[PDB]
Design an enzyme around this catalytic site. Structure first.
Site, PDB file in Angstrom:
ATOM      1  N   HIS A   9       8.309 -25.461   5.256  1.00 21.55           N
ATOM      2  CA  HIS A   9       9.109 -25.249   4.060  1.00 21.55           C
ATOM      3  C   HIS A   9      10.419 -26.032   4.141  1.00 21.55           C
ATOM      4  O   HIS A   9      10.704 -26.867   3.280  1.00 21.55           O
ATOM      5  CB  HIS A   9       9.366 -23.749   3.885  1.00 21.55           C
ATOM      6  CG  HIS A   9      10.034 -23.382   2.596  1.00 21.55           C
ATOM      7  ND1 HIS A   9      11.303 -23.802   2.266  1.00 21.55           N
ATOM      8  CD2 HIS A   9       9.618 -22.600   1.570  1.00 21.55           C
ATOM      9  CE1 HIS A   9      11.638 -23.308   1.088  1.00 21.55           C
ATOM     10  NE2 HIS A   9      10.632 -22.575   0.643  1.00 21.55           N
ATOM     11  N   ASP A  16      -5.072 -24.251   9.318  1.00 14.30           N
ATOM     12  CA  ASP A  16      -6.283 -25.053   9.190  1.00 14.30           C
ATOM     13  C   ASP A  16      -7.341 -24.342   8.363  1.00 14.30           C
ATOM     14  O   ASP A  16      -8.384 -23.932   8.867  1.00 14.30           O
ATOM     15  CB  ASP A  16      -6.827 -25.506  10.550  1.00 14.30           C
ATOM     16  CG  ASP A  16      -6.819 -24.398  11.576  1.00 14.30           C
ATOM     17  OD1 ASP A  16      -6.837 -23.216  11.172  1.00 14.30           O
ATOM     18  OD2 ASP A  16      -6.795 -24.714  12.785  1.00 14.30           O
ATOM     19  N   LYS A  45      -6.946 -28.526   5.043  1.00 11.79           N
ATOM     20  CA  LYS A  45      -6.181 -29.660   4.527  1.00 11.79           C
ATOM     21  C   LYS A  45      -6.175 -30.656   5.656  1.00 11.79           C
ATOM     22  O   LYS A  45      -6.155 -31.873   5.452  1.00 11.79           O
ATOM     23  CB  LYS A  45      -4.754 -29.253   4.166  1.00 11.79           C
ATOM     24  CG  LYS A  45      -4.037 -28.461   5.236  1.00 11.79           C
ATOM     25  CD  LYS A  45      -2.611 -28.168   4.829  1.00 11.79           C
ATOM     26  CE  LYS A  45      -1.905 -27.366   5.903  1.00 11.79           C
ATOM     27  NZ  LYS A  45      -0.534 -26.959   5.470  1.00 11.79           N
ATOM     28  N   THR A  46      -6.199 -30.084   6.859  1.00 15.57           N
ATOM     29  CA  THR A  46      -6.426 -30.804   8.100  1.00 15.57           C
ATOM     30  C   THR A  46      -7.451 -31.931   7.859  1.00 15.57           C
ATOM     31  O   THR A  46      -7.160 -33.110   8.101  1.00 15.57           O
ATOM     32  CB  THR A  46      -6.857 -29.806   9.251  1.00 15.57           C
ATOM     33  OG1 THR A  46      -8.236 -29.433   9.120  1.00 15.57           O
ATOM     34  CG2 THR A  46      -5.986 -28.529   9.237  1.00 15.57           C
TER      35      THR A  46
END
Ligand SMILES: Nc1nc2c(ncn2[C@@H]2O[C@H](COP(=O)(O)OP(=O)(O)OP(=O)(O)O)C[C@H]2O)c(=O)[nH]1
Ligand SMILES: [Ca+2]
Ligand SMILES: [Ca+2]
Length: 1203
Positions: free
Chosen positions: A344, A302, A305-306
């Site tokens: 990922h 955090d 983009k949260t």
RNA sequence: GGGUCCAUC
RNA sequence: AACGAUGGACCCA
């Protein structure tokens, strides 16, 4: 700025703490370089303090072995990205080494020896790192296996060598056995389990030792499966590990296998709705052809983009305009879909699988912290997935009162970027804050506008499909007298104009030709454009020179290759994929645009086993060329099942089954089981005996036995089997039994419609006095029908649903039934039906012609039961064509009454419920559709509809008698709308009945004449039915008692009591197999025999040829082998990690198809489409091949697992 | 989809 | 020589 901090990089160049934890712990240290270092040390544990407030279900596992002493380590964290991170590797590699030599086992002991270094590498990371649980194993000759960081195992053997324990470690990792020996399981964990299950089964009503023996054999299996010993060895599943050990005189002292994040829960994250709520607090306060652009946010847990995706949504909305969980927003010029990259492997999966192709990432880093260690891994994912462009948002700048410092962080990111061959010097970097942008702050608000401007500006517009060089994957090839050879398919990209030269490339030497023309069903065309279904005519080429699987491209545009590197994802079990791992020589089918093709693969160095769910990379070499660009998607298949998706990376340069066995099986299959008497009856009788009931005295008792509707479920079940089992046997001797019965029935329904037809056109009881339930439901139902249906069948409706389907017509016998034959041969048609044909013939350039024009259909007879056939009627071809149009539209409209004629499972479940609650009734009409009169339809349907029904029916019938009927019923069985029309009529009345009774209409559910409504409504339903000319079948209608039936499922007090039928004289081994398998499925609970039935099964299994006694398939694979255990099957060949069992198939001979007809049928099909982890759509639909069944049997090898 | 086979309406 | 519809398995690819 705010303070004097211009060279704080020295304070961070050894702490990696942050520009606001360095610039901060420096203003309270008055500027002492070595002083701040310490203020952060003892304060860095208070951040790790609230750190433990974050669930950390990712991480790694590690294993180490001292030639004889082993340890397995589990160290958690919050994401994929830190787990691959260099620093997180070093911490846990040390806590591992420093747990081997210093042989530890006490978890919380190794923990506190590594607590101060744990806060040193938790302040630097920003994620809750935490050595979860450690353990260790010692044995004679022990070994380990690890794939990636996710699963690690330690195995302890004795009498085993190097490989053996490697392999058993691998197996343990694939099959995760809770115990080494079946005998290990808690000799009282199972005790309670056998005591609970023993009742469960005793409840059905089965006698002590029946539930006993079943529960036993059950639990004997249960244990062997959750145990190393009794698990089929992963590297050869035909024998168990149990057997594997015994052949190497070996034994396992024990094993351990950890899996990262086991037992955690890790609450699910729904990003799309994440922003909805984030924007919630802030929610209060032609040009429909814009390019779609895919972006994703990527960054530390955090750093924001949260919230930054929120800010983009609000700010973009506030200012301008307004699959798989994705935010999306708009720009004056573009449209954007936005995904989060939380992991990922999670992402790589979606990129391969094609569930998330990124046109550009936006990398979010908060300047409060600056780049983090794992930001290396974020940019690395981008590198690996090939995202073309990366934009950077510096977040939380409101908390950086010194611009000199922003330039510091901006410079770092520009450097990490370039380390990974991204253009770090030239990449757009926005300095802003989402924190204060969603909350209205024109300052930081336009910074979001600045970033959006960079999505419009820096991420280039994605090349429109229509802009790329032409290409059409070829689905089928046709030789058309006079026209020439034509290929059909969907133009994948670009335009093709007639005249242009084209290349045909793929399976064989590439060839060239030239586009003579382009056509659809309706129009002929100058060009075919991207996304269009067309046929394309070629010059010179022969039909045998082209092949499905090839493509048709603008010459030079695309080349044929055989070898390539790919990124594939292998589906998990829970995704319909393999349930067992594969190894070195995996040999599946690779499905490209439109065809399968064989190929071998090579795994990368250091991977020897792939499990379902894996993101392997592999080099695939094909058995022959096929046209491939870069980034082409394919499916991985095993005989029709998709078990993997892949995309091609770099295109490279290029460079066992049993024949006597199959022959032995075929000779066996074509043999005849030879017996004295009625073998079906012998079987039925032996079964009745094994269950303690009296056998059938004679052939006559088989068809005249009535069940008792009481007794325990167990006793009813067999009793009901007895009543049903021989009830459709087509081969009884004794019987003056003929199809004379069918025809009498058929005449009786007609006579009945005659009466109802008379009576119903006379709704005048000589006076305005008497009121009736019948008249009332018709009036009620009429009005409801009209609201559901319209005044008339829409144009769109018809054009969406008319089509040819299936079997014989007035002009074609069954062997010429294929749709392509209905387009080739001329079809009959009714006088009133003629205008439909003409309108069809006016809509295309193709020839639509009429063999004859006539009011007859052909009444013939088909099999039904031992007492009677069923009279159906064969329609005129063109009337059918139109009958399926209306049938298809009634099908759509019925969904609004919650009637779903594609799913018989609703009626099955409601029948089950009914037998438990007694609130629902299963109702059956005696001659459902033959009793639906003209008069009843006329005053139930809108005039518009009634007329179209009357055009489309066949008004007269020609019987095998030579004689005629003029149809009193509205339509016979065989007519393409009869089934949807009866469904409609029945629902409407029942629904009306509900209303007149103050019941809920939605409790009405119908499939053909299989009617389910509330029990209370039945007496009134019976009366309405009587009035409109129906006869309810009291024998098959149940409004009370323990029993219900709908759509072939039968219940008794909730228990499945469905029987099986022996329909024919059993004469071939396949016949007998069918019977034995039906016995299997009726008497087997989850693979375990009811012993009463097993004795009968084993006895008649002996009548088969010997090899067929042991040729077993799993359930769910048809009836060309006995259902049983495929791991015991001596005939099962394993080829390239896939199992093939041979099964009996009906032997066929190829026939010649009609070329113009098949072409037509193809085009007509594509016209129909146009007007009507998720990658089942990497596949097409197939050519048209005709065949004839000889009466012989063939033996076919088919892929099967155990799904 | 089309066939074959299994349930079904 | 056997109609229309559904769902499943294989085969068609
Ligand atoms: N074309 C066609 N339609 C069928 C067939 N079987 C059933 N249906 C449809 O399902 C409904 C009837 O199912 P059934 O209950 O078996 O036949 P029924 O005519 O009502 O006669 P009964 O209850 O006395 O056996 C009406 C009919 O249109 C069939 O084999 N072919
Ligand atoms: Ca019926
Ligand atoms: Ca019924």
């Amino acid at each position: 700025a705010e303070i004097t901090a211009s060279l704080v990089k020295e304070l961070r160049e050894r702490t990696g703490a942050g520009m606001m934890d360095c610039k901060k712990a420096l203003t309270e240290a008055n500027g002492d370089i070595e002083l701040a270092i310490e203020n952060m040390r003892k304060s860095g544990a208070i951040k790790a303090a609230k750190k433990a407030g974050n669930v950390a279900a990712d991480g790694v596992i590690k294993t180490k072995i001292d030639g004889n002493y082993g340890i397995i380590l589990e160290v958690n964290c919050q994401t994929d990205f830190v787990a691959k991170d260099a620093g997180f590797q070093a911490f846990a590699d040390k806590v591992l080494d420093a747990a081997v030599a210093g042989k530890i086992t006490d978890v919380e002991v190794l923990k506190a020896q590594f607590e101060e270094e744990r806060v040193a590498l938790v302040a630097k990371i920003g994620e809750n790192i935490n050595i979860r649980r450690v353990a260790a194993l010692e044995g004679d000759v022990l070994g380990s296996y690890q794939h990636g960081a996710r699963i690690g195992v330690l195995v302890a053997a004795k009498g085993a060598d190097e490989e053996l324990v490697k392999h058993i470690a691998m197996h343990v990792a694939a099959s995760k056995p809770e115990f080494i020996k079946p005998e290990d399981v808690s000799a009282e964990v199972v005790e309670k389990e056998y005591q609970v299950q023993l009742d469960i089964a005793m409840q059905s009503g089965k006698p002590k030792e029946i539930a006993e023996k079943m529960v036993e054999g059950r639990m004997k299996k249960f244990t062997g499966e959750v145990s190393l010993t009794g698990q089929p060895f992963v590297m050869e599943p035909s024998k168990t590990v149990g057997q594997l050990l015994k052949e190497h005189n070996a034994e396992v002292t024990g094993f351990i296998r950890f899996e990262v994040g086991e037992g955690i829960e890790k609450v699910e994250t729904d990003f799309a709705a994440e922003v909805a709520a984030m924007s919630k607090q802030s929610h209060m306060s032609f040009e429909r052809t814009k390019p779609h652009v895919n972006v994703g946010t990527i960054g530390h847990v955090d750093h924001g983009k949260t919230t930054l995706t929120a800010a983009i949504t609000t700010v973009l909305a506030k200012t301008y305009g307004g699959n798989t969980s994705h935010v999306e927003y708009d720009t004056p010029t573009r449209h954007y879909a936005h995904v989060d990259c939380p992991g990922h492997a999670d992402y790589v999966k979606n990129m391969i699988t094609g569930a998330a192709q990124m046109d550009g990432a936006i990398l979010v880093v908060a300047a409060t912290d600056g780049p983090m260690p794992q930001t290396r891994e974020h940019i690395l994912l981008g590198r690996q997935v090939g995202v073309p462009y990366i934009i950077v948002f510096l977040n939380k700048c409101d908390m950086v009162d010194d611009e000199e410092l922003l330039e510091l962080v901006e410079m770092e990111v520009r450097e990490l970027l370039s380390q990974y061959d991204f253009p770090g010097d030239d990449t757009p970097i926005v300095r802003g804050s989402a924190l204060k942008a969603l909350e209205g702050d024109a300052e930081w608000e336009a910074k979001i506008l600045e970033l959006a401007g960079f999505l419009d500006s820096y991420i280039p517009e994605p090349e429109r499909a229509i802009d790329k060089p032409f290409l059409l994957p070829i689905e089928d090839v046709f030789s058309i007298s006079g026209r020439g050879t034509v290929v059909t398919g969907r133009v994948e990209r670009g335009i093709i104009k007639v005249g242009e030269e084209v290349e045909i490339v793929g399976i064989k030497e590439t060839q060239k030709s030239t586009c003579t023309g382009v056509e659809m069903f309706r129009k002929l065309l100058d060009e075919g454009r991207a996304g269009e279904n067309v046929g394309v005519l070629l010059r010179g080429i022969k039909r045998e020179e082209i092949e499905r699987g090839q493509v048709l491209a603008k010459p030079g545009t695309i080349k044929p290759h055989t070898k390539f590197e790919s990124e594939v994802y292998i589906l998990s079990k829970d995704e319909g994929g393999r349930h067992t791992p594969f190894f070195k020589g995996y040999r599946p089918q690779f499905y490209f645009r439109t065809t399968d093709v064989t190929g071998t693969i090579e795994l990368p160095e250091g991977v020897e086993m792939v499990m379902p769910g894996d993101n392997i990379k592999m080099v695939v070499t094909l058995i022959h060329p096929i046209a491939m660009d870069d980034g082409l998607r394919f499916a991985i298949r095993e005989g029709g099942r998709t078990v993997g998706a892949g995309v091609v990376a770099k295109v490279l340069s290029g460079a066992s089954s049993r024949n006597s066995l199959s022959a032995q099986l075929r000779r066996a299959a074509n043999t005849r089981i030879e017996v004295e008497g009625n073998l079906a009856l012998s079987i039925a009788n032996d079964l009745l005996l094994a269950y303690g009931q009296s056998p059938f005295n004679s052939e006559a008792e088989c068809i005249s036995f009535s069940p008792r509707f009481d007794g325990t479920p167990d006793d009813f079940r067999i009793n009901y089997l007895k009543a049903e089992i021989m009830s459709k046997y087509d081969d009884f001797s004794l019987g003056i039994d003929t199809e004379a019965v069918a025809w009498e029935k058929f005449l009786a329904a007609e006579a009945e419609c005659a009466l109802t037809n008379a009576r119903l056109y006379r709704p005048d009881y000589s006076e305005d006095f008497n009121f009736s339930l019948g008249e009332s439901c018709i009036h009620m139902a009429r009005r409801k029908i009209a609201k559901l249906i319209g005044d008339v069948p829409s144009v769109e409706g018809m054009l969406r649903h008319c089509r040819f389907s299936g079997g014989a017509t007035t002009t074609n016998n069954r062997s010429y039934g294929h749709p392509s034959f209905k387009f080739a041969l001329p079809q009959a048609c009714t006088p009133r039906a003629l205008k439909y044909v003409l309108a069809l013939r006016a809509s295309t350039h193709f020839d639509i012609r009429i063999s004859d024009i006539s009011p007859f259909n052909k009444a013939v007879t088909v099999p039904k039961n031992s007492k009677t056939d069923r009279c159906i009627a064969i329609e005129p071809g063109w009337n059918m064509f139109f009958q399926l149009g209306i049938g298809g539209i009634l099908r759509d409209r019925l969904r609004c009454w919650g009637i779903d004629l594609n799913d018989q499972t609703i009626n099955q479940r409601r029948a089950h419920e009914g037998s438990v609650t007694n609130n629902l009734a299963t109702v059956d009409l005696s001659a459902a559709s033959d009793s639906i009169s003209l008069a009843l339809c006329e005053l139930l349907l809108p005039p518009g509809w009634f007329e179209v029904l009357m055009d489309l029916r066949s008004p007269k019938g020609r019987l095998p008698d030579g004689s005629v009927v003029t149809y009193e019923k509205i339509s016979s069985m065989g007519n393409g709308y009869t089934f949807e029309l009866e469904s409609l009529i029945f629902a409407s009345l029942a629904r009306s009945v509900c209303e007149i009774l103050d019941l809920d209409s939605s409790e009405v559910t119908v499939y053909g004449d299989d009617i389910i409504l509330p029990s209370c409504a039945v007496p009134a339903l019976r009366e309405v039915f009587k009035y409109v000319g129906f006869t309810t079948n009291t024998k098959k209608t149940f409004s009370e008692g323990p029993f219900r039936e709908s759509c072939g499922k039968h219940y008794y007090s909730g228990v499945d009591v469905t029987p099986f039928y022996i329909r024919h004289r059993i004469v071939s081994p396949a016949d007998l197999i069918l019977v034995l398998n039906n016995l299997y499925r009726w008497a087997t609970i989850d693979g375990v025999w009811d012993p009463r039935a097993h004795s009968v099964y084993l006895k008649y299994r002996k009548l088969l040829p010997k090899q067929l006694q042991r040729n077993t398939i799993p359930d769910g694979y048809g009836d060309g082998a006995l259902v049983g255990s495929v791991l015991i099957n001596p005939f099962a060949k394993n080829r390239g990690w896939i199992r093939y069992v041979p099964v009996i198939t009906d032997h066929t001979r190829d026939r010649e198809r009609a070329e113009l007809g098949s072409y037509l049928y193809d085009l007509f099909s594509r016209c129909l489409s146009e007007s009507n982890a998720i990658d089942q759509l990497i596949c097409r639909s197939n050519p048209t091949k005709i065949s004839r069944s000889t009466g012989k049997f063939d033996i076919q090898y088919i892929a099967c697992s155990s799904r």
